[PDB]
């Protein structure tokens, strides 16, 4: 039968729906045939190991807007066919054991936005070869470890805006060959490594606005062969010698770019680097 507080139906997909009830625990007895489980908007604070193990055909699991504080490392064991997992809006989660998503080889969408996440642990996204959308915005991330996304060969959207990231290291984005949109705005980025985007050959959208960049190496932009939309506004660009390479790259860029306002020298304050003549910049 259907557990209390839940409503169950069989078509078009077997669904067990128990959202917005104020539940503290995962209902016991969720139909093993469930393809979709909706538990969002409750007051669940812990997801025990094998909480959904019997539901081998589960493809959609919503646990967003709960009060998750801890997810057992084996919470999603048995869910090899899982395609969409929404854990967003659990602001006190703070950390996810790095083995939590291992084995989710069919996962296409993973929502971890607004989870107070402080770090991306070793192997957190290992083996998620089918992942296409990864939402990590509005968390508490401050660093991007090397190769964190290297197995995400099919990822097309990576949202990291609204965190406190201060640097983009050389190997942060290795392996993201299918990436189409990379959102890094509203962070504290002060430095981008010259080879930070080496593998992003299909990237079409790059947002870096609202950060702390005073300069950006053109070598980082050089391999972005498909780039079409670039936002660099709202950074304290210094328009002296150091802006000459970026100025030349902006002249060559055939896509769409935002204004690139100079913060210094006063003479050029407020002026868009794109609209200046190289004659306007101090020489090196
Ligand atoms: C979730 O995963 C599957 C959903 O697609 C589902 O598959 C199986 O479902 C039945 C579980 O016992 C199993 O046996 C039933 O069907 C047998 C006859 O086969 C029928 O179904 C096939 C499906 O391809 C068709 O050729 C045709 O409809 C045929 O008549 C009989 O023994 C009984 O009718 C029995 O009830 C199915 O064979 C099997 N389906 C498939 C596609 O392989 C899983 O059961 C679900 N997992 C769980 C445990 O919830
Ligand atoms: C990452 O995306 C890949 C590209 O979309 C995807 O590749 C494969 O996608 C399907 C699913 O396996 C394959 O389709 C097969 O096609 C062959 C005919 O050549 C037949 O065996 C049958 O028709 C089958 O559907 C694609 O061929 C294949 N794409 C290519 C060209 O490599 C990956 O599966 C995906 N990664 C993950 C883990 O989901």
UniProtKB/Swiss-Prot annotation:
SS bond list: 2-8, 6-18, 239-262
Annotated glycosylation sites: 57, 154
Post-translational modification: N-glycosylated. O-glycosylated. Contains terminal sialic acid groups on its glycan chains.
GO terms under biological process: axonogenesis; cell surface receptor signaling pathway; corpus callosum development; negative regulation of axon extension; negative regulation of axon regeneration; negative regulation of neuron projection development; neuronal signal transduction; positive regulation of GTPase activity
Keywords: Cell membrane, Cell projection, Disease variant, Disulfide bond, Glycoprotein, GPI-anchor, Leucine-rich repeat, Lipid-binding, Lipoprotein, Membrane, Receptor, Repeat, Schizophrenia, Signal
Effect of substituting residue 252 to D: Decreases interaction with MAG
Name used for this protein in its record: Reticulon-4 receptor
Quaternary structure annotation from Swiss-Prot or TrEMBL: Homodimer. Interacts with MAG. Interacts with RTN4. Interacts with NGFR. Interacts with LINGO1. Interacts with KIAA0319L. Interacts with OLFM1; this inhibits interaction with LINGO1 and NGFR. Interacts with OMG.
Location, primary (coarse class): membrane
Ranges for domain LRRNT: 2-29
Source organism, top-level taxon: Eukaryota
Gene of this entry: RTN4R
GO CC term (a single one): external side of plasma membrane
Span of domain LRRCT: 235-284
One Gene Ontology molecular-function label: neuregulin receptor activity
UniProt tissue specificity: Widespread in the brain but highest levels in the gray matter. Low levels in heart and kidney; not expressed in oligodendrocytes (white matter).
UniProt-reported outcome of changing residue 174 to E: Impaired ganglioside binding
